[PDB]
Amino acid sequence: SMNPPPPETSNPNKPKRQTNQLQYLLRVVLKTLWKHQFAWPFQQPVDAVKLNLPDYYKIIKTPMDMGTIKKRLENNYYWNAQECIQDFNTMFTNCYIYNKPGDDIVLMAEALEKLFLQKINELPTEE
Ligand SMILES: Cc1nnc2c3ccccc3c(-c3ccc(N4CCOCC4)c(NS(=O)(=O)c4ccccc4Cl)c3)nn12
């Protein structure tokens, strides 16, 4: 029971939207990060059971990962690009909360974060 239920990827009440920016977030931004050598720890919810991290969810109360973001984009869960960007941002800050500066996982997150900022600087004007 160490793992909480994963974040929702669809919700019957939450309104859905599609935009060219959200398409870009899936097809370019998420894809670019997903395929990076350092992606793997970020591709699914942290499994505190498999990784033997019994304190992870004692500390992190707003977990977020790229697997969840990918499904959310595929499901048109977000109203706009900012909601999606917020999830990526939570993902990175979580890592910096839980881990010490200079840990390998943190260096990985930092590299992905840099790339993320490069990609969202090219987010297209909404059409
Ligand atoms: C995200 C996140 N934030 N903190 C962590 C973290 C902190 C301590 C140990 C692991 C993590 C992980 C993490 C999540 C998944 C994985 N893998 C998923 C695929 O199957 C092999 C394991 C890993 N791999 S891992 O080999 O444990 C590892 C990765 C990076 C740096 C150090 C280590 Cl020891 C690491 N992800 N993570």
Closest residue by Cα to residue 72 from 18, 127, 33: 18
User: What CA–CA distance (Å, rounded) separates 80 from 86?
Assistant: 10
Asked whether residue 9 is domain-assigned, the answer is no
| CATH code of the domain containing 109 | 1.20.920.10
**Domains held by the chain: number:** 1
Mutate to test the pocket of ligand 1, among 105, 106, 112 (most ligand atoms within 8 A of CB): 105
| Both tokens assigned to 106 | 């943190």
Asked whether residue 71 is domain-assigned, the answer is yes
Cα dihedral sign, 11-15-20-25: negative
Angle between helices 104-120 and 81-98 (to 10 degrees): 160
- What's at 109, amino acid-wise? A
Closest residue by Cα to residue 58 from 46, 66, 75: 46
Contact 41 CB / ligand 1 (< 6 Å): yes
Domain that holds residue 78: 19-123
User: What CA–CA distance (Å, rounded) separates 37 from 88?
Assistant: 18
Asked whether residue 114 is domain-assigned, the answer is yes
DSSP structure string for 3-61: SPPPPPS--SSSPP---HHHHHIIIIIIHHHHTSTT-GGGSS---TTTTT-TTHHHH-S
